[PDB]
A paper describes a structure:
The CRL4Cdt2 ubiquitin ligase complex is an essential regulator of cell-cycle progression and genome stability, ubiquitinating substrates such as p21, Set8, and Cdt1, via a display of substrate degrons on proliferating cell nuclear antigens (PCNAs). Unexpectedly, we found a PIP box in the C-terminal end of Cdt2, and showed that it directly mediates interaction of Cdt2 with PCNA.
Our search revealed a PIP box sequence from amino acids 706 to 713 in the C-terminus of Cdt2. To confirm that this PIP box motif in Cdt2 interacts directly with PCNA, and to quantify that interaction, we synthesized the peptide corresponding to the human Cdt2 PIP box (704-717) (SSMRKICTYFHRKS) with a carboxytetramethylrhodamine fluorescent label at the N-terminus (Cdt2PIP) and characterized its binding to recombinant PCNA, by fluorescence polarization (FP). Cdt2PIP binds PCNA with high affinity (57 ± 3 nM). The corresponding Cdt2PIP-3A peptide showed practically no detectable binding to PCNA in the same assay, suggesting that the Cdt2 PIP box binds PCNA in a manner very similar to other known PCNA complexes with PIP box peptides. To confirm the binding mode of the Cdt2PIP and Cdt1PIP peptides to PCNA, we determined the crystal structure of both complexes by X-ray crystallography, to a 3.5- and 3.4-Å resolution, respectively. PCNA adopts its well-characterized trimer conformation, with one peptide bound per monomer. Some notable differences in the binding mode are the conserved Phe713/Phe11 side-chain ring that rotates 180 degrees between the two structures and the Tyr712/Phe10 that repositions so as to extend more towards a hydrophilic environment in Cdt2. The Ile709 and Val7 side chains occupy a similar space in the hydrophobic recognition pocket. The average buried area upon the binding of the Cdt2 peptide is 692 ± 6 Å2 and average calculated energy of binding is −13 ± 0.2 kcal·mol−1, whereas the average buried area upon the binding of the Cdt1 peptide is 650 ± 4 Å2 and average calculated energy of binding is −8.3 ± 0.5 kcal·mol−1; these confirm the tighter binding of the Cdt2 peptide to PCNA. The affinity of the Cdt2PIP peptide for PCNA is similar to that reported for the tightly binding p21 PIP box peptide (50–85 nM), as it was confirmed in our assays (RRQTSMTDFYHSKR, 36 ± 2 nM).
Residue numbers in the entry:
A (entry chain D), E (entry chain F), F (entry chain B): 705 to 715
B (entry chain C), C (entry chain E): 1 to 255
D (entry chain A): 1 to 188, 192 to 257
The structure:
């Protein structure tokens, strides 16, 4: 599949 | 007012070569500390982080932090008009919504002198933590570039296995499958041909070569590149920029 | 009968390199005085003038004037089959509607021997008056080629400013605008890298890079190129051909 | 249970460069005697013959003669992933319907290691007889490639005339016609030479010849072998390991 | 707003 | 015109 680096960081 | 005189023009061109292919628009954060930029791709899967220390440049003068929004495609087009030996001076005022670029020639026959429109940008700065990585690999940038480019002809996706001994890049196609295996460098060599692996735990992750091949556009910046990995956390591809700083690419894995 | 033996084969190939990309069909005027050709583009905005003196060639023999109509793409295709070292001999009879080309090698072990069909053409010869020009610039052909090519990436059009001091090539895009400024050079080592400006009055005119970039196709004919300009009258771009003559390109400005 | 270790990786890459443009699939016949491959084009007008002697390789070990069918486009793609100085080792099992390829570097601290799926192919192997040829021409492969390429811009077809003195390549277009004449030369990569039993003039589709010349990175020279109403042979020598021969039928209208 | 060189020469 | 090299070899 593959997700967003949105999910892995944020702020 | 802000102004930075970069002697090694090329350094700049080679950077926009790396970026424009991955990100169209991006916000340049300018500081007395230097030029820092961070932006995700079109699709929010890869992220790019740029750091040029003010030490890096011959002149450097910035009074207030600037937030310059730039169409990097626009700007690449401009830098393409700069000779590799060119001295590239950059200049912006505060209320200025244009960035001036000035290219002086080797032994100064000629002086190009562009001026680029900016844009306003929303930029949710993502907190990237400093973190130890299960595996860090230092290897020829050229070899890495070459590997990601070859396997793209086998499959969509690369699997990176890593241990003490070595690192394996693999893909599966309709046509077959390929395993490219590199070993930590014995005769622990003259280092721009050499491979080294700091290894806390073995690691095996899966990434879209599609993106990696936008990253390798930075290989003209450094002989080596360093891959940093931990399970269920993004890959970091770090291209050193010639004492001025670095360009880091970040990519999510799969499922 | 007509026949011209050119030692420097290349010289001829390099000519059709310049033309075929700008004009498809064209009428070659052959004289005891030599080879003269004049033709506008598809669109009647640019005009090309060729002058090769008969003195230039090793043989040259033409009894009656010929008016040979040629698909230059057809003819370029033929000249592409000629080695750069090749001796090119040309030959036609009067009522002959085919033109023979013979390529001898310096090998003298190879001898190519083509023959090209002609066409009938309507050809309004334009009277170009020989003109004093407000500004005439002599500069590297390479640099000129390079400038017109780079600015094409900023905008549609180049503005050429000219003074005593120097000559400035500018374009405006959506993205921004660029000024490339070259200065007259002192204590001229040579001419090959050097810029010189005869100037009656300062001049600033505006031309479509579209066309200029079809002109620069002639840069393999000459290290330098000479730009000749007057207010509301066409630009002349003159590429010298190695003592045999010259290749002049003419372009209308904008209003 | 088979494995062949080829020192000069490039030699292999350069082969698939030659073939893939002319023939998509083909069956690789491997023997204790070496690697032999034969296939016609899409349209059954040209035929290609490969011969690589086992002598040619550093290792060579073949227990069962294998008949490996491969999409050469598939296989080109794989060989593109091999450095020119790469050592290419090949490996197949008996009941194996995949061929393994292993690329060792001059590094000897990179080793690529691919594996390619096969296909089943019927291919009626044609008996090629050994033949004396009215005319055999030896000339630079580069010059030949260059001639076939230029004349393709004049016409469809090349006429090759051959006499004691020299060999003449001609084509007629809508645009015109060209005659390129080469002569036997002084001192023999550089030179043109003509064994000539009787003069010959034959006509061939440049379309095909230009698929053959894709092999010119295999040899400085190429040898053309001709007799009336029997195919042309274009022979590219492979560096002592063997040869790559291309065969083409002639023409003649009414 | 570019002209034709027929206007600028002729004959 | 042009023939097939099927014709010129076979088996």
């Amino acid at each position: 599949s593959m997700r967003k680096i949105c999910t892995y960081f944020h702020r | 007012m802000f102004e930075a005189r970069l002697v090694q023009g090329s350094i700049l061109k080679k950077v926009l070569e790396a970026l424009k292919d991955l990100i169209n628009e991006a916000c340049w954060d300018i500081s007395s500390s230097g030029v820092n930029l961070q932006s995700m791709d079109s699709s929010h899967v890869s992220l790019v982080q740029l750091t040029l220390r003010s030490e890096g440049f011959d002149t450097y003068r910035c009074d207030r932090n600037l937030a310059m929004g730039v169409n990097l495609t626009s700007m690449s087009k401009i830098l393409k008009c700069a000779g590799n030996e060119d001295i590239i001076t950059l200049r912006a005022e505060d209320n200025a919504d244009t960035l001036a670029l000035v290219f002086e020639a080797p032994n100064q026959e000629k002086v190009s002198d562009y001026e680029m429109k900016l844009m306003d940008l929303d930029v949710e700065q993502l907190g990237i933590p400093e973190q130890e990585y299960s595996c860090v690999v230092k290897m020829p940038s050229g070899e890495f570039a070459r590997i990601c480019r070859d396997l793209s002809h086998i499959g969509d996706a690369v699997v990176i296995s890593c241990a003490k001994d070595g690192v394996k890049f693999s893909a599966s196609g309709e046509l077959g499958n390929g395993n490219i295996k590199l070993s930590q460098t014995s005769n622990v060599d003259k280092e721009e041909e050499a491979v080294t692996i700091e290894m806390n735990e073995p690691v095996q992750l899966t990434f879209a070569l599609r993106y990696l091949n936008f990253f390798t556009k930075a290989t003209p910046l450094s002989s080596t590149v360093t891959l940093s990995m931990s399970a269920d956390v993004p890959l970091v591809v770090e291209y050193k920029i010639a004492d001025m700083g670095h360009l880091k690419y970040y990519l999510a894995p799969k499922i």
